[PDB]
Amino acid sequence: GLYLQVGAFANPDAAELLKAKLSGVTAAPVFISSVVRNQQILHRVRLGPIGSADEVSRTQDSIRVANLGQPTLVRPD
Ligand SMILES: CO[C@@H]1O[C@H](CO)[C@@H](O[C@@H]2O[C@H](CO)[C@@H](O[C@@H]3O[C@H](CO)[C@@H](O[C@@H]4O[C@H](CO)[C@@H](O)[C@H](O)[C@H]4NC(C)=O)[C@H](O[C@H](C)C(=O)O)[C@H]3NC(C)=O)[C@H](O)[C@H]2NC(C)=O)[C@H](O[C@H](C)C(=O)O)[C@H]1NC(C)=O
Protein backbone atom coordinates (compact mmCIF):
# COMPACT_ATOMS: atom_id res chain seq x y z
CA GLY A 1 0.00 0.00 0.00
CA LEU A 2 1.26 3.42 -1.09
CA TYR A 3 0.76 6.69 0.79
CA LEU A 4 0.99 10.37 -0.12
CA GLN A 5 1.55 13.34 2.15
CA VAL A 6 0.03 16.61 0.94
CA GLY A 7 1.06 18.94 3.76
CA ALA A 8 2.21 19.20 7.34
CA PHE A 9 0.87 21.91 9.63
CA ALA A 10 1.33 23.28 13.10
CA ASN A 11 -2.23 24.66 12.90
CA PRO A 12 -4.62 21.69 13.29
CA ASP A 13 -7.41 23.70 11.64
CA ALA A 14 -5.30 24.05 8.49
CA ALA A 15 -4.70 20.29 8.48
CA GLU A 16 -8.39 19.48 8.99
CA LEU A 17 -9.41 21.89 6.23
CA LEU A 18 -6.96 20.36 3.76
CA LYS A 19 -8.16 16.87 4.71
CA ALA A 20 -11.76 17.93 4.00
CA LYS A 21 -10.79 19.50 0.66
CA LEU A 22 -8.88 16.38 -0.41
CA SER A 23 -11.89 14.14 0.22
CA GLY A 24 -13.51 15.95 -2.71
CA VAL A 25 -10.68 15.19 -5.16
CA THR A 26 -9.79 11.57 -4.30
CA ALA A 27 -11.59 8.38 -3.28
CA ALA A 28 -8.60 7.14 -1.28
CA PRO A 29 -8.80 7.47 2.52
CA VAL A 30 -7.56 10.84 3.77
CA PHE A 31 -6.28 11.05 7.33
CA ILE A 32 -4.19 13.20 9.64
CA SER A 33 -1.18 11.72 11.40
CA SER A 34 -0.09 13.98 14.26
CA VAL A 35 3.40 13.63 15.76
CA VAL A 36 5.73 15.49 18.08
CA ARG A 37 8.52 17.06 16.05
CA ASN A 38 10.96 19.73 17.19
CA GLN A 39 9.01 20.28 20.44
CA GLN A 40 5.80 21.01 18.55
CA ILE A 41 2.83 19.03 17.33
CA LEU A 42 2.95 18.53 13.57
CA HIS A 43 -0.26 17.53 11.78
CA ARG A 44 0.53 15.59 8.60
CA VAL A 45 -2.24 15.30 6.01
CA ARG A 46 -1.93 11.97 4.23
CA LEU A 47 -3.85 9.65 1.97
CA GLY A 48 -3.77 5.96 1.27
CA PRO A 49 -3.27 3.12 0.97
CA ILE A 50 -3.28 3.49 -2.81
CA GLY A 51 -3.16 0.21 -4.71
CA SER A 52 -0.84 1.03 -7.62
CA ALA A 53 1.83 3.43 -8.83
CA ASP A 54 -0.41 4.55 -11.70
CA GLU A 55 -3.16 5.53 -9.29
CA VAL A 56 -0.59 7.40 -7.18
CA SER A 57 0.47 9.37 -10.26
CA ARG A 58 -3.13 10.22 -11.22
CA THR A 59 -3.90 11.17 -7.60
CA GLN A 60 -0.88 13.49 -7.50
CA ASP A 61 -2.15 15.08 -10.71
CA SER A 62 -5.65 15.62 -9.28
CA ILE A 63 -4.23 17.24 -6.15
CA ARG A 64 -2.16 19.62 -8.27
CA VAL A 65 -5.16 20.44 -10.48
CA ALA A 66 -7.07 21.34 -7.31
CA ASN A 67 -4.13 23.56 -6.21
CA LEU A 68 -4.05 21.67 -2.91
CA GLY A 69 -0.29 21.23 -2.60
CA GLN A 70 2.72 19.29 -3.86
CA PRO A 71 1.94 15.71 -2.81
CA THR A 72 4.89 13.43 -2.09
CA LEU A 73 5.17 9.71 -1.48
CA VAL A 74 5.76 8.87 2.18
CA ARG A 75 6.18 5.62 3.94
CA PRO A 76 3.56 5.15 6.71
CA ASP A 77 4.51 6.61 10.08
C1 LIG B 1 12.76 15.44 2.67
O1 LIG B 1 12.22 16.01 3.86
C2 LIG B 1 10.84 16.21 3.79
O2 LIG B 1 10.57 17.24 2.84
C3 LIG B 1 9.18 17.54 2.72
C4 LIG B 1 9.02 18.53 1.55
O3 LIG B 1 7.67 18.60 1.09
C5 LIG B 1 8.64 18.10 4.06
O4 LIG B 1 7.23 18.39 4.01
C6 LIG B 1 6.73 19.67 4.11
O5 LIG B 1 7.09 20.26 5.35
C7 LIG B 1 6.84 21.67 5.35
C8 LIG B 1 7.42 22.26 6.65
O6 LIG B 1 8.77 21.83 6.80
C9 LIG B 1 5.33 21.95 5.21
O7 LIG B 1 5.13 23.35 5.09
C10 LIG B 1 3.96 23.85 5.60
O8 LIG B 1 3.74 24.46 4.33
C11 LIG B 1 2.42 25.03 4.24
C12 LIG B 1 2.22 25.52 2.79
O9 LIG B 1 1.86 24.42 1.95
C13 LIG B 1 2.26 26.15 5.28
O10 LIG B 1 0.94 26.71 5.21
C14 LIG B 1 0.66 28.01 4.87
O11 LIG B 1 1.23 29.01 5.71
C15 LIG B 1 0.94 30.35 5.26
C16 LIG B 1 1.69 31.28 6.22
O12 LIG B 1 2.98 30.72 6.49
C17 LIG B 1 -0.57 30.59 5.26
O13 LIG B 1 -0.88 31.92 4.80
C18 LIG B 1 -1.26 29.54 4.37
O14 LIG B 1 -2.69 29.71 4.45
C19 LIG B 1 -0.86 28.12 4.80
N1 LIG B 1 -1.42 27.09 3.89
C20 LIG B 1 -2.43 26.24 4.27
C21 LIG B 1 -2.84 25.28 3.19
O15 LIG B 1 -2.95 26.26 5.38
C22 LIG B 1 2.52 25.58 6.69
O16 LIG B 1 2.52 26.66 7.66
C23 LIG B 1 1.26 26.84 8.37
C24 LIG B 1 1.28 28.26 8.92
C25 LIG B 1 1.06 25.79 9.52
O17 LIG B 1 2.08 25.17 9.96
O18 LIG B 1 -0.13 25.65 9.92
C26 LIG B 1 3.87 24.85 6.75
N2 LIG B 1 4.06 24.17 8.03
C27 LIG B 1 5.22 24.25 8.77
C28 LIG B 1 5.15 23.47 10.05
O19 LIG B 1 6.22 24.88 8.44
C29 LIG B 1 4.77 21.26 3.95
O20 LIG B 1 3.33 21.31 3.94
C30 LIG B 1 5.23 19.80 3.84
N3 LIG B 1 4.88 19.26 2.51
C31 LIG B 1 4.27 18.04 2.41
C32 LIG B 1 3.97 17.62 0.99
O21 LIG B 1 3.99 17.36 3.39
C33 LIG B 1 8.89 17.08 5.19
O22 LIG B 1 8.62 17.74 6.45
C34 LIG B 1 7.35 17.46 7.07
C35 LIG B 1 7.16 18.52 8.15
C36 LIG B 1 7.32 16.01 7.65
O23 LIG B 1 8.42 15.54 8.03
O24 LIG B 1 6.20 15.41 7.69
C37 LIG B 1 10.37 16.64 5.20
N4 LIG B 1 10.60 15.56 6.18
C38 LIG B 1 11.60 15.64 7.12
C39 LIG B 1 11.68 14.44 8.02
O25 LIG B 1 12.36 16.60 7.23
Residue numbers in the entry: 266 to 342
The study reports:
In order to characterize how the SPOR-RlpA domain interacts with denuded PG, we solved the X-ray structure of the complex with compound 1. Co-crystallization and soaking were both performed in parallel and resulted in two structures for the SPOR-RlpA:1 complex at near-atomic resolution (1.30 and 1.48 Å, respectively). The two structures are identical (rmsd of 0.16 Å for the 77 Cα atoms); the description provided herein is for the 1.30 Å resolution cocrystallization complex. The opposite face (convex face) of the SPOR domain does not present any of the features observed for compound 1 interaction, thus pointing to a single PG-binding site per SPOR domain, consistent with the mass spectrometric data. The high-resolution data for the SPOR-RlpA:1 complex allowed us to map all the amino acids and water molecules involved in glycan-chain recognition. (ii) Notwithstanding that all four saccharides interact with the protein, interactions are not evenly distributed among the four subsites. (v) Main-chain interactions are essential in PG stabilization by SPOR domains. (vi) hydrophobic interactions are observed with F274 and L307. In agreement with our mass-spectrometric experiments that clearly noted the absence of binding of compound 5 to the SPOR domain, the crystal structure of SPOR-RlpA:1 reveals that recognition of the carboxylate moieties of muramic acids at positions 1 and 3 is crucial.
